[PDB]
Structures are given as C-alpha cells and as structure tokens.
Amino acid sequence: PSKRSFIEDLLFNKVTQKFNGLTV
Amino acid sequence: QCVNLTTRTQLPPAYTNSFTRGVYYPDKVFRSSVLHSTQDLFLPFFSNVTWFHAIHVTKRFDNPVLPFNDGVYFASTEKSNIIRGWIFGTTLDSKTQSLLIVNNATNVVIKVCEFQFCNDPFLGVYYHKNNKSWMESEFRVYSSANNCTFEYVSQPFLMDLEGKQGNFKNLREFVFKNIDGYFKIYSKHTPINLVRDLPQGFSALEPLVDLPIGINITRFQTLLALHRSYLTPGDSSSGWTAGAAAYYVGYLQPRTFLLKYNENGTITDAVDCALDPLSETKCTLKSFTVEKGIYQTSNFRVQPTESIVRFPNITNLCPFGEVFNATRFASVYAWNRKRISNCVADYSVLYNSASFSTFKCYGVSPTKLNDLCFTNVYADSFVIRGDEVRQIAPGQT
Amino acid sequence: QFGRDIADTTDAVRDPQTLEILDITPCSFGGVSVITPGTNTSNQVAVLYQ
Amino acid sequence: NTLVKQLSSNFGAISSVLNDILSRLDPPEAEVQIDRLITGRLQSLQTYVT
Amino acid sequence: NTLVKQLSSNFGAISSVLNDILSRLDPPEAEVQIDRLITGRLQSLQTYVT
Amino acid sequence: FELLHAPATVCGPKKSTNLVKNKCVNFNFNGLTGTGVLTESNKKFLPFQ
Ligand SMILES: *[C@@H]1O[C@H](CO)[C@@H](O)[C@H](O)[C@H]1NC(C)=O
Ligand SMILES: *[C@@H]1O[C@H](CO)[C@@H](O)[C@H](O)[C@H]1NC(C)=O
Ligand SMILES: *[C@@H]1O[C@H](CO)[C@@H](O)[C@H](O)[C@H]1NC(C)=O
Numbered sequence A: 001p002s003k004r005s006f007i008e009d010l011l012f013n014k015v016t017q018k019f020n021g022l023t024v
Numbered sequence B: 001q002c003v004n005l006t007t008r009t010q011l012p013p014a015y016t017n018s019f020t021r022g023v024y025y026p027d028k029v030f031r032s033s034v035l036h037s038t039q040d041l042f043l044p045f046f047s048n049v050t051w052f053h054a055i056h057v058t059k060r061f062d063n064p065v066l067p068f069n070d071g072v073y074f075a076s077t078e079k080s081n082i083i084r085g086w087i088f089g090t091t092l093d094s095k096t097q098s099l100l101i102v103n104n105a106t107n108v109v110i111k112v113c114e115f116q117f118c119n120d121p122f123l124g125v126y127y128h129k130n131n132k133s134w135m136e137s138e139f140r141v142y143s144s145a146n147n148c149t150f151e152y153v154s155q156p157f158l159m160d161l162e163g164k165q166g167n168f169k170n171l172r173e174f175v176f177k178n179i180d181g182y183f184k185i186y187s188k189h190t191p192i193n194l195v196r197d198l199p200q201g202f203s204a205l206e207p208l209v210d211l212p213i214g215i216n217i218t219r220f221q222t223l224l225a226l227h228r229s230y231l232t233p234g235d236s237s238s239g240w241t242a243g244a245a246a247y248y249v250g251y252l253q254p255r256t257f258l259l260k261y262n263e264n265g266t267i268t269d270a271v272d273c274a275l276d277p278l279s280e281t282k283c284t285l286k287s288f289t290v291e292k293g294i295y296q297t298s299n300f301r302v303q304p305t306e307s308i309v310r311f312p313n314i315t316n317l318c319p320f321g322e323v324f325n326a327t328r329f330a331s332v333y334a335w336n337r338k339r340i341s342n343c344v345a346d347y348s349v350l351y352n353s354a355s356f357s358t359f360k361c362y363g364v365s366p367t368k369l370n371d372l373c374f375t376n377v378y379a380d381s382f383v384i385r386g387d388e389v390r391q392i393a394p395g396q397t
Numbered sequence C: 001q002f003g004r005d006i007a008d009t010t011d012a013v014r015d016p017q018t019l020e021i022l023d024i025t026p027c028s029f030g031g032v033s034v035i036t037p038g039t040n041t042s043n044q045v046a047v048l049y050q
Numbered sequence D, E: 001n002t003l004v005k006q007l008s009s010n011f012g013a014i015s016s017v018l019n020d021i022l023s024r025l026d027p028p029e030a031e032v033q034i035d036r037l038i039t040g041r042l043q044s045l046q047t048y049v050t
Numbered sequence F: 001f002e003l004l005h006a007p008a009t010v011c012g013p014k015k016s017t018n019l020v021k022n023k024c025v026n027f028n029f030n031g032l033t034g035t036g037v038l039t040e041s042n043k044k045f046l047p048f049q
Helices: A006-012 B277-285 B366-371 B387-391 D002-008 D018-024 D034-049 E002-008 E018-022 E027-049
Strands: B014-018 B034-042 B047-053 B072-078 B083-089 B098-104 B107-128 B133-154 B168-179 B182-194 B206-212 B219-224 B246-251 B253-261 B267-272 B293-296 B336-339 B378-381 C012-014 C021-023 C032-036 C046-049 F025-029 F032-036
Touching (some): B083 B107, B083 B168, B253 B277, B277 B293, B366 D018, D018 D034, E002 E027, E018 F032
Antiparallel strands (some): B047 B246, B253 B267, B293 C032, F025 F032
16 A cells, blocks of 8 residues: 555564644 | 704705824824834724705705714815814813804914803804905803803904805814813814815824813814804794805724835825734835835734633622621730631621721732632731831741 | 543542533634735635634 | 642642632732742743753 | 843843842842843743753 | 823923033933934925924
8 A cells, every 4th residue: 555665564574742833 | 042943854964984194293293204003093094974954045054063983074165265264072061161263363272171051052244245355243052151260262354154165275273172171172174175075195294283072072062153044034043045165074092003204204105004904014024115025914813702701600798707806816926716618708798887997908809809710718817016017027037 | 530541640530419420522623824925925824724 | 740749839838729819819919929939830841941 | 132132021020120129129029020130031042051 | 001102291300401412422312212413414304203
C-alpha cells in the first residue's frame, strides 16, 4: 500500500497538551 | 414657551452606508511620517447608519428624541443652516440637570441647568417678509430652569437664518463623547457638492473644546429652526412648513485602529484592525501593503454559552449569635475553641448588625466570603484589652 | 471526588447531587492563518483554521 | 514535558491555579499576587525558546 | 527596532521615565519604583545579546 | 489632579528665565524636564498641539 521499500519499512518500526496552547 | 407640535407627517426610517468618516486626532501630541496604532472608541466603517430628513414634498418634520449611546457620530449635509443646537441629558424635566446647546441671534450658548425642557421643543423661526428677514419669534424650547451650574456664552457672530434650498453645498461633522465627567467635542467642516448622501474619500476631525459636566446623559435631541410665513397659516404649532434638511447619526463602539501620519502630521489614512482577515493581517504586520505569502493571526475560541452551579443540598444555617454575642468568654491564656460544620454561613447579616470595631481578614477578601465553600471551619475566641488587639495579626510578637 | 490528568489538570469530577462522574473537555480552540496573493495584485483571500 | 510541569510551580504565589486566587481575592490584592506568577511563567517560557 | 521600543513599557511602575519619577517622588519612595524599571529593562538587553 | 497630560494654568511659584539657545542645558517646561540642545524648529503644529 505504501511504496516504501522493504528495508525502509523494516527501518521505520525500529523507532518510537493541546489544552495548554502547545501545538504541532 | 412650550407647546406640542401639530400637522406633522411621519414616515418609516431610511438607511445608508457608513463610508470612512469617523477619525480624529486622539490627542494633542504630534507625530509625523510614521504608522501608529491606538485602542479607542470609533465608528466602524461601512456601519449601517440611519438617515433622517424633513421635506415638504406633507410636513415630514418629526425630529424624534434619540437615545444617547456611549458615543455619537453626527454630521449634516447643510443648506440654510437649519441646525441650531443640541440637547443632552436623561430626564429632561429639571428632576436632573441637563445640557443645552444653542446658536441664536442673541448669543451662542452652552448651559447645564435644572431645565424643564418642553415636550416637543423648537424655535418658532419666522420671516419678516416686509423686510425679508428671518428670526426666532417663539422660544418654545424650555419653560424654566431651577438652577444653572455651568453657563458659557459666545457671540451671535454669523447667525444667518436665511437661505435657498437645493443640493447641499456644506458639511459639518461632529463627534460627542462624555467620559470622566468631561464632554469632548471634535469637529470638521467640509465644502461639498453632492446629491444628498454621505461623501466619499477621507478626512479627519479635530478636537474643539473639552468641558467638565457632572451629569450622566442617556437621551439627546437636535435643536432646529422651523419656518413660518404668510404661506404657513395656522397657530404657532400648525402654521409652519417643512424645509428639505437632512442629517445622519452613527453610534460609536470599541475599536482598534492603525493610523498613518504624513510628514505634516495629518491622518491621511487609517485601517480597522477588526474589519476583515486581510485587514487584520495588515494590522498584524503594521504595514499598509503585504506581499504574497502566508501569515497567522489571533487564535479562535468558542465562548461559554451557559453557566451552572452545583452545590450539595445543604439546608442548615451555621451558629453565629452563640459565638459573637455569647454570655461569656475565656481568658486568653486558655482561649476557647469551637467547631462549625454542616451549615451555611452569611457574613452580611453580621456586618449589618454587629458593631465590630475591627474585622480584618488574611488570605481572603471578606466581600467574597459568601461566594465560597469550606472545610475544617473552626472558631477561636478570647478577651484582651483594647491596646492588645494589635497582637492578633499574623507574625505579630 | 476528583480525577486529575498527567498534565496536572482536573480532568473529571463527581456531581454532588448525583454522585455521577463527569468528564470535561475545554471549549474548542483553533489555530488561524491567512493566505494572500500579494496586495499589489488582488484582495481576495482564503482563511485556514489549523 | 518539563514545560508543562512548570505550570504547577507557585513561585511564591498563594496558589498554583490562578482561578483560585482570582476567585478568593479582590483585584487590589490579586494584582500584587498574579504579578508574580506571570514573571515566573515568562522566565520558564524564555528558557525554553533559548 | 524592538530593543528600542521596549523603553516605553511601564513594567508596573507608575510612569515610564526616570524624570517623571525623580521630579515626582522622594528618594525613599522612589526605590520601589526604580527597581522595577531596572529589572524590566535589563532583561531586554540580556535577551537581545543572546 | 492630572499631570502633564495637557497644559493648565495651575503652576508653581518659580520664576521663568530667559530662553538660551544652542547650548547643552538643563531645561524644564511646566514640569516636563530634560537635558540637551534647543534649536529653532522647522516643524509646524496644528494650533492645539
Ligand atoms: C435650586 O436647588 C435647590 C437645591 O436644594 C432647590 O431647593 C431649588 O428649588 C432649586 N431652584 C431654585 C428655585 O433655587
Ligand atoms: C505638507 O505641507 C507642505 C507645505 O505646505 C505641502 O507642500 C505638502 O503637499 C503637504 N503634504 C501633505 C500630503 O499634506
Ligand atoms: C447575635 O448575633 C446574631 C447574628 O448576627 C443575631 O441574629 C442575634 O440577634 C444577636 N443577638 C443579640 C443578643 O444581639
């Protein structure tokens, strides 16, 4: 479904307030 | 004199658009070649503004009393000078003092008095056709005043009451604000030649005078000249005709403006910091031009629409007389302790009855004590001398 | 009687009449932005709520 | 996380939550108390940006 | 431009200018006026220099 | 009372001096005070300013 490559899709998964005015 | 007017015709109101008008120098400082902002009461641009007029066509003078809002804008396109003054006050009946403004062939006058104004006041301005001269023949404006506390007078310098109708050729603009017990007047004249509407383009008013008055004002009226001649048979309340005059009033409200000062310190342009998201962006950058781009402005919030209160179903009332007017007290070395629980308090019934010499409070404000809910409520009590009450404060020694 | 969230804030409350627990969520808050073509071209603008 | 926890610090004001002060005290006493929280909060905000 | 315009903020003193204090107030009274302005102005240089 | 917001005729007993020009001087006018050089103005005012 994503065109992300086999090694990239392996790579992603190795990695891991709004009421206070904090936003992203 | 006083009377009630008769033989009028009255009609539904008319309305027009508040093109950019209501700007003045906010204070007697000087600045130039600069953009500066101020937070002040103003007329928002494009405000819906009521149109009033009086025409023969009928006799469409009805000139009703209008509510004095916390500020008024007034202007008239002018011909034959039919405006002669204004009236401002609340009760208008000598039960309160009120302000009068007059411009007549005897004197130009400002007075604050216990005026008993008339119920439908006017000047009975009449024509000596045999000598082609116009004058007020009836002062049908107030009967009396019980006292006057301010009076000021200026000359009848140019009290010309004669002219001929047509397109308006003049424009007198006024703003009236009463704040901190002072009436501040700002004005402008402008020559015009316009078909009976608000002008286009821009100009800004200047402060004229600043007069102290103690009164509060809630209603206002315009003081006008009527017309009477051989063409107007009747009594002094029916034997009159309508002219062709018109005037407009706009009501001020809180605003923020950005103001452009030329090298000569004249307000050549202004921007309403609330009219529009583009206008608010202009205000955000403090510039009249903005380049292609994306910008951010004031946040979006949703107001609390209702209020609710949920105290428990208490019914009992606390002990009070059994504490503050008891038979006996402890020696202070062995001071007494008492519990208060499961009950409602009220301090106000204490303040209104008990002649306490002192009622100090710490960490709370006593006025708010009825607004709260509490735990572990204890009372201490003892007797000491009058000198010794000094010691009963936090950090005493 | 109360709850608190990990942001140190009172998230929930017991009603004194019904002893029913109620959850609070603040009034809606929005981020606002404005898009412009440049003033020396046109004055129609689009507004974006973030 | 540190910045949100800093809301609970009282900086020597009577209470952490302003609504407690701004309810239980009248303006001329609140206005010498709330004055401290603002200075404490600003300095925590200033440090974050730096 | 910002660092200059900070000269006009009152920081809670009665007025924005030393002359408008020293002409108005006795020296024992003035110090709890002037010590406000020193605090409020000094922080703006420290912020700008950083 | 109000204070330097606008001119009013309730002023203290001091006497005015002559108006010295082009010198570094202390100056004060109706309370407003400063130090500097004073020179002929090239700036117009509206009569109320
Ligand atoms: C003026 O004011 C006093 C206020 O006591 C009032 O008694 C009096 O009727 C007023 N008018 C006259 C006639 O002086
Ligand atoms: C400013 O005043 C000067 C001198 O009267 C005049 O030449 C100039 O056109 C004025 N500028 C404006 C826009 O008022
Ligand atoms: C004592 O104080 C209470 C509360 O104010 C009051 O209701 C009561 O009448 C007082 N009794 C006397 C003896 O004054």
